[PDB]
Design a protein around this ligand. Structure first.
Ligand code: STZ
Ligand code: CA
Length: 579
């Protein structure tokens, strides 16, 4: 089950063993990063590793795809061939090789691969608590594993990339940590893109221009080889696309064209989605016209939160006269901070790879939890035409938490919707039991017998959520993930219990039992409010919501309805509300 799926793949249905004795050909010649991975997989048979042009992979150079980051991989009993179009490609061959190895044994196959989107990875662009240094080292290694080549770096607690301290050099301590990120991004074939955010206090004069240049040069000396300049945050003169183009072209010419090894050079426009673009203005096409063709322009789609469509990307491509570099604002939850967004990644058109220069995801402030979407994005961006939302979602989860994948699946299935929000952006959730939920409720609401099978499905779900919750909380394979999701897990358990007791009210043996359940529900609704007042307290959407699209309303509505039915029956007046 390769992730991302290779462009071309032929499997033989024979299978050889990792050879106990082998002979490495190209050890000296291939990308050291890939070879290091090979040595670690290899802790006799001919294994050939190298890039196009290496003496070691001469025999196979017609098999190597002619694409940046492409590779040829081969496995049969005679030899193993791992051969890149360039260094990054060989490393990518090795990342695929590692997924093939299962029990010192390899399948016999032949693969020709390359990415369909040129740039792919993550932009650290969410409001909230910034990630720790450690979380970032871990992200970078996860990117290399999934062949993401882009990391746009922006922690919001580092003031040396924005007003006013962008002007200033990183202090020693922070510098060295930053170097460490760059070192790790290099080893894993990721472009560390340092992004500067000047728009707040930038002057259109030559001195500020020079200070930026020198800042870029300092980052260069610390190892950075890719750069972004942000203009989303600016006003007045600064909003002139003409002048933005001049400054960026200026940096291209005096800097990027002058160093030998500058990879990405990227800007974020002042109008970065169609809806905040002024059709009575000039901004985009002027930028398109005046900005050097090798400079990327970032774009989030039709609206701030938006999936990428064919209409959507034509519309921006026509204007900037190049393929947009997509900034996808999902799974970022910084405007729905009381939700986790753990669902699958979908909605982006799968036939538009030629039309986009980059694809990056803006993740949640929950770094590990974000790995589900991130792995899915890497898959989508590498081979959109073979993109399989749901298999890739299950694959991500099995990858992040193999020892409790079914449990994270159950939990994630019911934590994907945003609930109503200022952006009007929603996701599906709980689709598996939706039909049973809706039938049971329609029948139940109208005094009409519900179906036993729907009742049992709901029962079953609640039981399974409790099991999953409890396994999740005690799991120690990925502690960071568990630390991140714990409050919500507790909340998810409470939801399940609440569901169980309400269902017991529906089954309703006798009046006294019914009041026990009723009081137990009130008490549980009560601990949910507790958690929601004491956990995840942030200024904007403080708290913890879970299972909110289908499940909590099914339970609330079933509760109101059953109490109503109880009040008629016994001329009682129990409060029927869930709030
Ligand atoms: C491209 N871009 N800023 O340049 C953004 O997407 N910025 C913020 C982005 O940082 C934020 O996560 C979302 C949702 O809160 O709102 C956007 O406006
Ligand atoms: Ca070489």
């Amino acid at each position: 089950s390769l992730q991302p799926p290779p462009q071309q793949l032929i499997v033989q249905n024979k299978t050889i063993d990792l050879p106990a004795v082998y002979q490495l050909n190209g050890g000296e010649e291939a990308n050291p990063h890939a070879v290091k991975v090979l040595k670690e997989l290899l802790s006799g048979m001919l294994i050939s590793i190298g890039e196009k042009g290496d003496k070691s992979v001469r025999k196979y150079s017609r098999q190597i795809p002619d694409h940046k980051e492409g590779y040829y991989l081969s496995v049969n009993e005679k030899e193993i061939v791992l051969a890149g179009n360039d260094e990054r490609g060989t490393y990518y061959a090795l990342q695929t090789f590692a997924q093939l190895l299962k029990d010192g044994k390899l399948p016999e196959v032949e693969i020709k691969d390359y990415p369909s989107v040129r740039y792919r990875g993550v932009v650290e662009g969410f409001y909230g608590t910034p990630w720790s240094h450690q979380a970032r080292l871990s992200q970078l290694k996860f990117y290399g594993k999934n062949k993401m080549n882009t990391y746009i770096y922006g922690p919001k607690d580092d003031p040396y990339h924005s007003a006013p301290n962008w002007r200033l050099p990183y202090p020693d301590k922070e510098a060295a940590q930053l170097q460490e990120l760059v070192a790790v991004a290099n080893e894993n074939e990721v472009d560390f893109v340092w992004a500067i955010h000047p728009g707040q206090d930038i002057k259109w004069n030559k001195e500020d221009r020079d200070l930026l240049l020198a800042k870029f040069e300092k980052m260069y000396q610390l190892g950075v080889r890719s750069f972004a300049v942000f203009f989303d945050d600016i006003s007045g003169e600064g909003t002139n696309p003409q002048k933005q183009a001049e400054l960026l072209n200026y940096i291209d010419e005096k800097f990027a064209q002058v160093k030998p090894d500058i990879n990405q050079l990227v800007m974020c426009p002042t109008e970065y989605n169609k809806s905040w673009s002024n059709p009575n203005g000039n901004y985009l096409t002027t930028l398109g016209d005046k900005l050097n063709p090798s400079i990327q322009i970032m774009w989030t789609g039709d609206r701030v939160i938006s999936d990428i469509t064919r209409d959507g990307i034509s519309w921006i491509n026509e204007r900037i006269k190049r393929p947009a570099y997509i900034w996808w604002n999902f799974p970022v939850s910084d405007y729905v901070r009381d939700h986790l967004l753990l669902g699958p990644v979908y909605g982006n058109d799968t036939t538009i790879a030629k039309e986009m220069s980059g694809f990056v995801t803006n993740p949640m402030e929950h770094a590990e939890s974000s790995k589900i979407a991130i792995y899915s994005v890497a898959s989508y961006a590498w081979n959109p035409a073979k993109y399989d939302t749901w298999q890739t979602w299950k694959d991500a989860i099995r990858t992040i938490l193999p020892s409790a994948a079914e449990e994270l699946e159950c939990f994630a299935m019911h934590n994907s919707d945003l609930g109503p929000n200022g952006h009007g952006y929603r996701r599906e959730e709980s689709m598996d039991i939706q039909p049973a939920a809706e039938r049971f409720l329609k029948a139940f609401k109208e005094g009409k017998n519900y179906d036993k099978a729907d009742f049992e499905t709901l029962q079953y779900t609640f039981e399974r959520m409790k099991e999953s919750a409890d396994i999740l909380l005690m799991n120690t394979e990925n502690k960071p993930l568990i630390v991140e999701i714990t409050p919500w897990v507790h909340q998810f358990k409470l939801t399940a219990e609440m569901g169980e007791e309400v269902l017991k009210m529906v089954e309703g043996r006798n009046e006294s039992y019914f009041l026990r359940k009723y009081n137990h529900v009130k008490a549980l609704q009560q601990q949910m409010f507790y958690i929601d007042q004491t956990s995840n307290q942030n200024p904007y959407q403080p708290g913890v919501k879970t299972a909110t699209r289908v499940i909590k309303p099914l339970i609330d509505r079933t509760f109101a309805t059953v109490v109503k039915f109880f009040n008629q029956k016994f001329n009682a007046h129990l409060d029927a509300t869930t709030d």
